[PDB]
């Protein structure tokens, strides 16, 4: 099957440059055009540019000429975007997409990568502190994940065996400039004494994983 | 740049009802072939293609989704809306400099559901670190509008709490919300009763705990 494989989230310094990649699998990269798209705060979508991987020829949204440069390495079936002169306005999710082609295909974007979430910041990485949120037949428990940087942390419960009733909240940026979030799950009150509940917290920017058994107090 | 003005930008619909989004363009998208597409982004996923060439359904897309229009006026219709159809819908043109519409947030309107409310004291682990976070959880409620207030020994707090809210649940169409009160350990041990008050409509629910008990 066709797949567009983009790296996970990256932290880069203001004023630096960053080159992000998109590896095409399941088709020949030169058979299709590629669009890059910027999404700010999960909301606004914005076309950056298009590249022909067989020619190398490019076309750019005016606002991004001089800012973004599209290139391809056909021998490794990988497309690249480099952003220069980075500022906090460049913190966004960058999508690489496959374009079906002209006319009958509609120039539509039929396959999308999962996106590279770029955080532009001068702040250092910091792993999270994880604290238990300890517990009509429905109990709530959870994990408070505090004082980490950059985003994201992901949270699972019982190594992914527990999914129903889980709510992992969007992080909030604290006045310290560090992020905090909580993940909670609702379970039968009567399960507290017999079932074990472990929150699995992964912070890849710091190469830290925390497993925390949440026990009744 | 050509502007794609979508209306409405916020679109509450009952399940089973018809949803219609208008996309109006400042310039005709006819190429001779009209390059107007519709994309959907569900919470936490990448955008995905729904309709290309104004009216052609992309592979694997149900026939409840339909596109129509010509020149500068275009419509996306969902005949019978399902819970899992929530997300942001975008029109997108590629006849000129590629542009997107602002996006239309499709929300599922449903019956009012009161939250189940839970309060969590700071953990002993955190207190040994010199800080105390108190967390109030509002689980599976509708509609999303709600006011959460912290009271400490019946004194209303301000400026020391933050909240965050989930996306609408694709199964039950509810929201959940957390509010977190942050104090120093030194301040936390100066008071007894910690309470979060949740008000929706004509009803307030207060959950509380007594410190050291």
């Amino acid at each position: 099957e066709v797949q567009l494989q983009q790296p996970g989230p990256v932290l880069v310094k203001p004023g630096a440059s960053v080159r992000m990649s998109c590896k095409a699998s399941g088709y020949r990269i030169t058979d299709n055009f590629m669009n890059w798209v910027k999404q700010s705060h999960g909301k606004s979508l914005e076309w950056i540019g298009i590249i022909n991987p067989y020619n190398g020829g490019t076309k750019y949204n005016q606002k991004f000429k001089g800012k973004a440069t599209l290139t391809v390495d056909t021998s490794s079936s990988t497309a690249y975007m480099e952003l220069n002169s980075l500022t906090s306005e460049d913190s966004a999710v960058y999508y690489c997409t496959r374009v079906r082609g002209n006319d009958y295909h509609g120039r539509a974007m039929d396959y999308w990568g999962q996106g590279t979430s770029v955080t532009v910041s001068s702040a250092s990485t910091k792993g999270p502190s994880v604290f238990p949120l300890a517990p009509g037949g429905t109990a709530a428990l959870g994990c408070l994940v505090k004082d980490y940087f950059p985003e994201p942390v992901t949270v699972s419960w019982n190594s992914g065996a527990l999914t129903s009733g889980v709510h992992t909240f969007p992080a909030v940026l604290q006045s310290s400039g560090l992020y905090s979030l909580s993940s909670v799950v609702t379970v039968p009150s009567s399960s507290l004494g017999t079932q074990t509940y472990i929150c699995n917290v992964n912070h890849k920017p710091s190469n830290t994983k925390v497993d925390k058994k949440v026990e009744p107090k | 740049d050509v502007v794609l003005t979508q209306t409405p930008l916020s679109l509450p619909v009952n399940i089973g009802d018809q949803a219609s989004i208008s996309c109006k363009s400042t310039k005709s998208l006819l190429n001779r072939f009209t390059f107007l597409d519709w994309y959907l982004q569900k919470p936490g996923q990448s955008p995905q293609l729904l309709i290309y060439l104004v009216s052609n359904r992309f592979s694997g897309v149900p026939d409840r989704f339909s596109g129509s229009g010509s020149g500068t006026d275009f419509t996306l219709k969902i005949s019978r809306v399902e819970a899992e159809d929530l997300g942001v819908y975008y029109c997108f043109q590629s006849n000129y400099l590629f542009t997107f519409g602002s996006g239309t947030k499709l929300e599922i309107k449903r019956t009012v559901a009161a939250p189940s409310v839970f309060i969590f004291p700071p953990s002993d682990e955190q207190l040994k670190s010199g800080t105390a976070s108190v967390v109030c959880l509002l689980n599976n409620f509708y509609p999303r509008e709600a006011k959460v207030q912290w009271k400490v020994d019946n004194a209303l707090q301000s400026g020391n709490s933050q909240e965050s809210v989930t996306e609408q649940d694709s199964k039950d169409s509810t929201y959940s919300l957390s509010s977190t009160l942050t104090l120093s350990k030194a301040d936390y041990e100066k008071h007894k009763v910690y309470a979060c008050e949740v008000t929706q409509g004509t009803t307030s629910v207060t959950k509380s705990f007594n410190r050291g008990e």
Partner: peptide, 10 residues
């Protein structure tokens, strides 16, 4: 026009 530039480009 930029429309024609894309037609040629495609």
């Amino acid at each position: 026009s930029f429309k024609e530039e894309l037609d040629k480009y495609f």
